[PDB]
């Protein structure tokens, strides 16, 4: 990830005018939609938290957890730490929390500035499947516009709901209780 850390704006977009900040969300949403499309229920939930982190969840199969035979870490960690892709989001997040529900098990992992704090670990059992990422954008990178703007997210998620017409997209703002549900049929 050092190439991204060296020139963040070249990977994510302008880091002073809010452009790059919102692009962080959109990169994560792309992966969540892909995951949701491979499942039965086909819903993603985007939440803006009161600490100005964002989470994206899907109810798909869960991203793969097995050890990548070539890299020697979990496949989820390969996705998060190898090179725009969610690895860029991770590199530019002061914290990122990953939760994967798959094959009867809950898996969790924490990153700080793209560095895993421990290996992906089984933490419990579950009947559900899906993936959730919550990220706190790094305030060492993102300046001036540091808070998410509901309308910027809503506009883009609406476009995505029409293109991905089988996918339900919920947007929730925990700062003021604002919510939308984009679903085309």
Other beta carbons within 10 Å of 39: 16
Distances in Å between the Cα of 72 and the Cα atoms of 110, 119, 149 are 18, 11, 39
The CB-side HSE value for 67 (13 A sphere, CA atoms) comes to 6
Buried b (16+ CB within 10 A) or exposed e, 124-150: eeeeebbbbbbbbbbeebbeebeebeb
| Ligand-binding site membership of 67 (annotated) | no
| Ligand-binding site membership of 58 (annotated) | yes
| Ligand-binding site membership of 4 (annotated) | no
**Catalytic annotation present for 27:** yes
Specify the residue, 57 or 168, whose C-beta has the smaller distance to ligand 8H8: 57
Specify the residue, 15 or 90, whose C-beta has the smaller distance to ligand 8H8: 90
Contact residues for ligand 8H8, defined by CB under 6 A = 28, 31-32, 35, 56-58, 63, 79, 86, 131-133
Specify the residue, 21 or 56, whose C-beta has the smaller distance to ligand 8H8: 56
- Structure token digits, residue 114: 């793209």
CB of 27 to ligand 8H8, least distance (A): 8
Give the annotated binding-site residues for ADP.
31
The residues that are catalytic are 27
């Amino acid at each position: 990830l050092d190439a991204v850390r060296k020139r963040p704006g070249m990977y994510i977009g302008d880091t002073d005018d809010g452009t790059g900040l919102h692009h962080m969300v959109f990169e994560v949403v792309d992966n969540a939609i892909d995951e949701a499309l491979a499942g039965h229920c086909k819903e993603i939930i985007v939440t803006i938290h009161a600490d100005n982190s964002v989470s994206v969840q899907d109810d798909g199969r869960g991203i793969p957890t097995g050890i990548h035979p070539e890299e020697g870490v979990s496949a989820a960690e390969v996705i998060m730490t190898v090179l725009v892709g969610v690895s860029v989001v991770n590199a530019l997040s002061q914290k990122l929390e990953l939760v994967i529900q798959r094959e009867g098990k809950i898996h969790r992992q924490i990153y700080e500035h793209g560095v895993p704090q421990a290996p992906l670990a089984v933490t419990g059992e579950t009947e559900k499947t899906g993936t959730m990422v919550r990220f706190w954008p790094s305030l060492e990178t993102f300046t001036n516009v540091t808070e998410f703007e509901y309308e910027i997210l809503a506009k883009r998620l609406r476009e995505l709901s029409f293109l991905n017409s089988g996918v339900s997209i919920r947007l929730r703002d925990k700062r003021d209780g604002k919510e939308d549900h984009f679903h085309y049929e």
